[PDB]
């Protein structure tokens, strides 16, 4: 045998943690991605990219730290340590938000290594790899928001930062400037994810209460752990129950377990389509007919028209410090207020 | 509208009980997806004899 | 001429039909509000 | 208010075209049962 064959069979030993060809992309990239988040949310500042503090060394707690984004003038720059901005200086590199990109890109290739790992593992045991396919819903979300979306904006500064309060901020930001709740694709995302949680609770409960071996002692001697269950309950008692409660039930176990896979995944995919649409600031912001009808008759008032006023507020009062590079100054007589209507 | 005006006055994102809720929902979706994928590759075929108004004797 | 032997019948049962129609009408109801804007 | 005719037709074809595809496929499946 040649050295290649010897390498290949070293990588696929039965052992506690599986290395594999996929491991070579996954493990260093994952370590550096994760570890960069940690070293940065403990030490690295953002006084120079946003005018904030965001690390423990400065004062902050677990919810208010973050590794934050670059400044707006940096463009879509890679932010290489050897690039023509840092020039081989680890301090400036930390100061310019250069390691947000480090984390992001290393985590993206860590994602890629994980899905390959799922393929070749599943190839080894010789089963269909549906879980690798399910896992491309998280990849879709990741790349459409953390990579594609600010690449449609003017800079990475409008990308979300890795941190709890920073992404709470992302929520309120999108609410204000895109009115993201009124977009049919996010509605389809909400329906999908909530339906996943619905199937999860209903299935667990139904199965746990149609168990075989409720009387005499277990006549089930295996698992056989890779079977999950499905042997341990009676399809007929559950199907008969739900045909009377709800009036429709599944009569095929395989199709039930396929529905549970379909729902959250199509869910994530649709919300991905919507947010890659927001990346060119095409917004289902308003119904044209409602605006006309409100202009001509100003006693018309809708829960929707209220949401527009509130979002105007979010934008106007949050902008100067969320975009401190624009230098917004709003005299207080120009800001919007309820008592002024 | 209810969601927006509720966050404004009670600041619920920073309230832990909603956070345990969000964790439950993302976790529910995750475990739903995983359970479906694992079982639906494992199963080869199932069968039960079926008669003219009921189901059979061995759910195989 | 002589028959193609790869010709296969297509099947569709009633429960699938009900889901499909549910899908058509429910998407239609979600998107009619944007189609009229 | 506005009443698009284009909106009327957009919804009309969106609900008529796939539904007729569906019912044709069913009605020619049932005739293969005998």
């Amino acid at each position: 045998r040649g050295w290649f064959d010897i390498l290949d069979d070293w990588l696929k030993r039965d052992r506690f943690v599986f290395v594999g060809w996929s491991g070579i992309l996954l493990f260093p990239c994952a370590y550096l991605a994760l570890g960069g988040w940690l070293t940065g949310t403990t030490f690295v500042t953002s006084w120079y990219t946003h005018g904030l503090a965001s690390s423990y060394l400065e004062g902050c707690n677990f919810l208010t730290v973050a590794v934050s984004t670059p400044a707006n003038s940096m463009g879509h720059s890679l932010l290489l340590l050897w690039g023509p901005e840092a020039q081989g200086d680890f301090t400036r590199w930390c100061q310019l938000g250069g390691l947000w990109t480090f984390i992001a890109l290393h985590g993206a290739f860590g994602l890629i290594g994980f899905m390959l790992r799922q393929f070749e593992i599943a190839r080894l045991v010789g089963v269909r790899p549906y879980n690798a396919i399910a896992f491309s819903a998280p990849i879709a979300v990741f790349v459409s928001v953390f990579l594609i979306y600010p690449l449609g904006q003017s800079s990475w500064f409008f990308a979300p930062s890795f941190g709890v309060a920073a992404i709470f901020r992302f929520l309120l930001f999108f609410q204000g400037f895109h009115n993201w709740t009124l977009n049919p694709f996010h509605m389809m995302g909400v329906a999908g994810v909530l339906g996943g949680a619905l199937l999860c609770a209903i299935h667990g409960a139904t199965v746990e209460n149609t168990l075989f071996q409720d009387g005499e002692g277990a006549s089930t001697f295996r698992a056989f752990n890779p079977t999950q269950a499905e042997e341990t309950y009676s399809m007929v008692t559950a199907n008969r129950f739900w045909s009377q409660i709800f009036g429709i039930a599944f009569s095929n176990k395989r199709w039930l377990h396929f529905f549970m896979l379909f729902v959250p995944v199509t869910g994530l995919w649709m919300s991905a389509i919507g947010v890659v649409g927001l990346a060119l600031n095409l917004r289902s912001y308003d119904f044209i007919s409602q605006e006309i009808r409100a202009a001509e008759d100003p006693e018309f008032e809708t829960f929707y028209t209220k949401n527009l006023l509130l979002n105007e507020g979010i934008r106007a009062w949050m902008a100067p410090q969320d975009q401190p590079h624009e230098n917004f100054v709003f005299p207080e007589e120009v800001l919007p207020r309820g008592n002024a209507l | 509208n209810f969601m927006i005006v509720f966050q404004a006055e009670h600041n619920i994102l920073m309230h832990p009980f909603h956070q345990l809720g969000v964790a439950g929902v993302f976790g529910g979706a995750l475990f739903c997806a995983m359970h479906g994928s694992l079982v639906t590759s494992s199963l080869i075929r199932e069968t039960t004899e079926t008669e003219s108004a009921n189901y059979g004797y061995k759910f195989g | 001429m002589e028959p193609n032997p790869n010709r296969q019948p297509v099947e569709l049962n009633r429960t699938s039909l009900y889901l499909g129609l549910l899908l058509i009408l429910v998407l239609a109801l979600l998107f009619s509000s944007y189609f009229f804007n | 208010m506005e009443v698009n005719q284009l909106g009327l037709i957009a919804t009309a074809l969106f609900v008529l075209v796939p539904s007729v595809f569906l019912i044709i496929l069913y009605v020619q499946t049932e005739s293969q049962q005998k």
């Binding site: 009036g247 429709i248 009569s251 | 079926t50 189901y55 | 049962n13 009633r14 429960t15 009900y18 129609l21 549910l22 009408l25 429910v26 239609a28 109801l29 009619s32 009229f36 | 009443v3 909106g7 009327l8 919804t11 609900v15």
Partner: peptide, 28 residues
């Protein structure tokens, strides 16, 4: 013409409910 469309498509959903409950396949 818009309100008509809303209520019509809803009318169709409840008819779908009725048939899917009382006229479903036999389990064979």
């Amino acid at each position: 013409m818009e309100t008509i469309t809303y209520v019509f498509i809803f009318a169709c959903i409840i008819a779908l409910f009725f048939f899917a409950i009382f006229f479903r396949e036999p389990p064979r």
